[PDB]
Protein backbone atom coordinates (compact mmCIF):
# COMPACT_ATOMS: atom_id res chain seq x y z
CA UNK A 1 0.00 0.00 0.00
CA UNK A 2 3.08 2.26 0.14
CA UNK A 3 3.01 5.12 -2.38
CA UNK A 4 6.04 4.82 -4.69
CA UNK A 5 7.25 6.34 -8.00
CA UNK A 6 5.90 4.56 -11.07
CA UNK A 7 8.21 3.10 -13.70
CA UNK A 8 10.13 5.77 -15.67
CA UNK A 9 8.82 8.50 -13.35
CA UNK A 10 10.97 11.20 -11.71
CA UNK A 11 11.08 10.33 -7.99
CA UNK A 12 10.71 12.91 -5.23
CA UNK A 13 12.99 13.08 -2.19
CA UNK A 14 9.91 12.60 0.05
CA UNK A 15 6.32 11.49 -0.36
CA UNK A 16 3.95 14.45 -0.02
CA UNK A 17 0.27 14.66 0.87
CA UNK A 18 -2.27 17.28 -0.29
CA UNK A 19 -4.87 18.37 2.27
CA UNK A 20 -7.64 20.94 2.22
CA UNK A 21 -9.96 22.67 4.58
CA UNK A 22 -13.03 24.84 4.11
CA UNK A 23 -14.70 26.85 6.86
CA UNK A 24 -18.31 25.66 6.99
CA UNK A 25 -8.87 17.97 13.75
CA UNK A 26 -11.02 16.57 10.94
CA UNK A 27 -11.47 20.11 9.68
CA UNK A 28 -8.40 19.27 7.59
CA UNK A 29 -8.95 16.42 5.11
CA UNK A 30 -6.51 14.40 2.97
CA UNK A 31 -6.78 14.50 -0.79
CA UNK A 32 -3.96 12.13 -1.69
CA UNK A 33 -0.28 11.21 -1.50
CA UNK A 34 2.30 11.20 -4.33
CA UNK A 35 5.91 10.07 -4.83
CA UNK A 36 7.03 11.52 -8.14
CA UNK A 37 6.91 14.71 -10.21
CA UNK A 38 4.48 13.04 -12.64
CA UNK A 39 2.12 11.95 -9.84
CA UNK A 40 2.27 15.48 -8.45
CA UNK A 41 1.17 17.07 -11.72
CA UNK A 42 -1.59 14.46 -12.05
CA UNK A 43 -2.95 15.37 -8.59
CA UNK A 44 -2.50 19.08 -9.21
CA UNK A 45 -4.44 18.89 -12.47
CA UNK A 46 -7.59 17.96 -10.50
CA UNK A 47 -7.41 20.81 -7.99
CA UNK A 48 -8.97 24.25 -8.33
CA UNK A 49 -6.32 27.00 -8.18
CA UNK A 50 -6.47 28.85 -4.85
CA UNK A 51 -7.10 32.13 -6.70
CA UNK A 52 -10.28 30.65 -8.17
CA UNK A 53 -11.78 30.21 -4.69
CA UNK A 54 -13.31 33.16 -2.79
CA UNK A 55 -14.77 31.35 0.25
CA UNK A 56 -12.69 30.76 3.41
CA UNK A 57 -10.37 27.91 2.34
CA UNK A 58 -6.91 26.40 2.75
CA UNK A 59 -4.73 23.99 0.78
CA UNK A 60 -1.92 22.22 2.62
CA UNK A 61 0.98 20.30 1.11
CA UNK A 62 3.01 18.42 3.70
CA UNK A 63 5.53 15.59 3.82
CA UNK A 64 3.75 12.27 4.23
CA UNK A 65 3.30 11.51 7.92
CA UNK A 66 3.14 15.16 8.96
CA UNK A 67 -0.31 16.50 9.81
CA UNK A 68 -0.80 20.16 8.82
CA UNK A 69 -1.15 21.32 12.40
CA UNK A 70 1.34 22.78 14.81
CA UNK A 71 0.58 20.16 17.47
CA UNK A 72 2.05 17.46 15.20
CA UNK A 73 5.35 16.20 16.64
CA UNK A 74 7.17 17.41 13.52
CA UNK A 75 5.73 20.94 13.92
CA UNK A 76 5.64 21.38 17.71
CA UNK A 77 9.02 23.12 17.95
CA UNK A 78 8.80 24.74 14.55
CA UNK A 79 7.50 27.88 12.91
CA UNK A 80 6.69 29.37 9.54
CA UNK A 81 7.46 32.21 7.16
CA UNK A 82 4.24 34.03 6.25
CA UNK A 83 3.52 36.29 3.29
CA UNK A 84 0.27 38.23 2.98
CA UNK A 85 -0.91 38.73 -0.60
CA UNK A 86 -3.38 41.05 -2.25
CA UNK A 87 -5.98 39.19 -4.29
CA UNK A 88 -4.78 37.89 -7.66
CA UNK A 89 -1.33 36.63 -6.58
CA UNK A 90 -2.04 33.42 -4.67
CA UNK A 91 -2.37 31.01 -7.62
CA UNK A 92 1.00 31.86 -9.10
CA UNK A 93 2.75 32.17 -5.75
CA UNK A 94 1.36 28.83 -4.51
CA UNK A 95 2.56 27.08 -7.65
CA UNK A 96 6.03 28.67 -7.40
CA UNK A 97 6.28 27.75 -3.71
CA UNK A 98 5.30 24.10 -3.98
CA UNK A 99 7.49 23.51 -7.04
CA UNK A 100 10.45 24.84 -5.04
CA UNK A 101 9.56 22.70 -2.02
CA UNK A 102 9.04 19.52 -4.05
CA UNK A 103 12.23 20.14 -6.02
CA UNK A 104 14.32 20.46 -2.83
CA UNK A 105 15.26 24.05 -3.60
CA UNK A 106 15.42 25.19 0.04
CA UNK A 107 18.58 23.16 0.80
CA UNK A 108 17.93 22.92 4.54
CA UNK A 109 18.15 19.16 4.90
CA UNK A 110 15.12 17.64 6.62
CA UNK A 111 13.84 20.94 7.97
CA UNK A 112 10.88 21.58 5.66
CA UNK A 113 7.49 20.31 6.92
CA UNK A 114 5.09 21.68 4.35
CA UNK A 115 3.38 24.68 2.76
CA UNK A 116 -0.06 26.29 3.13
CA UNK A 117 -2.10 28.70 1.04
CA UNK A 118 -4.99 30.39 2.84
CA UNK A 119 -7.81 32.18 1.08
CA UNK A 120 -9.25 34.93 3.23
CA UNK A 121 -11.67 37.83 2.82
CA UNK A 122 -9.54 40.54 1.21
CA UNK A 123 -6.15 38.86 1.13
CA UNK A 124 -4.53 35.49 0.79
CA UNK A 125 -1.73 34.09 2.87
CA UNK A 126 1.05 31.77 1.85
CA UNK A 127 3.42 30.08 4.26
CA UNK A 128 6.15 27.48 4.51
CA UNK A 129 6.64 25.52 7.73
CA UNK A 130 9.92 24.17 9.12
CA UNK A 131 10.84 21.90 12.05
CA UNK A 132 13.11 24.05 14.22
CA UNK A 133 12.09 27.65 14.86
CA UNK A 134 15.28 28.43 16.80
CA UNK A 135 17.57 27.34 13.95
CA UNK A 136 18.45 30.78 12.57
CA UNK A 137 20.72 29.47 9.80
CA UNK A 138 17.81 27.40 8.52
CA UNK A 139 15.12 30.07 8.80
CA UNK A 140 17.38 32.64 7.15
CA UNK A 141 18.10 30.29 4.26
CA UNK A 142 14.39 29.59 3.83
CA UNK A 143 13.75 33.33 3.72
CA UNK A 144 16.45 33.81 1.07
CA UNK A 145 14.98 31.01 -1.05
CA UNK A 146 11.45 32.46 -0.75
CA UNK A 147 12.71 35.78 -2.00
CA UNK A 148 14.28 34.06 -5.01
CA UNK A 149 11.45 31.67 -5.99
CA UNK A 150 8.35 33.81 -5.33
CA UNK A 151 9.47 36.68 -7.57
CA UNK A 152 7.45 39.22 -5.59
CA UNK A 153 8.52 42.86 -5.39
CA UNK A 154 11.71 43.48 -3.35
CA UNK A 155 9.87 45.44 -0.62
CA UNK A 156 7.52 42.50 0.02
CA UNK A 157 7.07 41.91 3.75
CA UNK A 158 7.71 38.39 5.08
CA UNK A 159 7.26 37.48 8.75
CA UNK A 160 8.49 34.50 10.73
CA UNK A 161 6.21 33.14 13.45
CA UNK A 162 7.11 30.40 15.93
CA UNK A 163 4.09 28.10 16.30
CA UNK A 164 4.04 28.20 20.13
CA UNK A 165 3.37 31.95 19.98
Amino acid sequence: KAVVPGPAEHPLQYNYTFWYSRRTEQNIKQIGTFASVEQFWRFYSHMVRPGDLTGHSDFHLFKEGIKPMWEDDANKNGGKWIIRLRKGLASRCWENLILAMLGEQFMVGEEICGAVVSVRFQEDIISIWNKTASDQATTARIRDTLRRVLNLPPNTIMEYKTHTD
Binding site: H10, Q13, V37, E38, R42, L99, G103, E104, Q105, M107
Partner: peptide, 26 residues
Protein backbone atom coordinates in the same frame (compact mmCIF):
# COMPACT_ATOMS: atom_id res chain seq x y z
CA UNK B 1 25.41 15.25 1.30
CA UNK B 2 22.89 16.77 -1.13
CA UNK B 3 19.53 15.09 -1.67
CA UNK B 4 19.34 12.65 -4.58
CA UNK B 5 16.26 14.25 -6.11
CA UNK B 6 16.62 17.94 -6.88
CA UNK B 7 14.51 19.63 -9.56
CA UNK B 8 14.69 23.17 -10.85
CA UNK B 9 11.46 24.97 -11.65
CA UNK B 10 12.19 24.51 -15.37
CA UNK B 11 12.81 20.79 -14.87
CA UNK B 12 9.43 20.49 -13.09
CA UNK B 13 7.71 22.11 -16.08
CA UNK B 14 9.68 20.00 -18.61
CA UNK B 15 8.21 16.94 -16.89
CA UNK B 16 4.72 18.50 -17.06
CA UNK B 17 5.14 18.96 -20.81
CA UNK B 18 6.08 15.29 -21.21
CA UNK B 19 3.08 14.24 -19.13
CA UNK B 20 0.74 16.46 -21.15
CA UNK B 21 1.79 14.90 -24.47
CA UNK B 22 1.35 11.28 -23.37
CA UNK B 23 -2.19 11.07 -24.78
CA UNK B 24 -0.51 9.40 -27.77
CA UNK B 25 0.70 5.84 -27.32
CA UNK B 26 4.46 5.30 -27.39
Amino acid sequence: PWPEYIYTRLEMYNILKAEHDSILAE
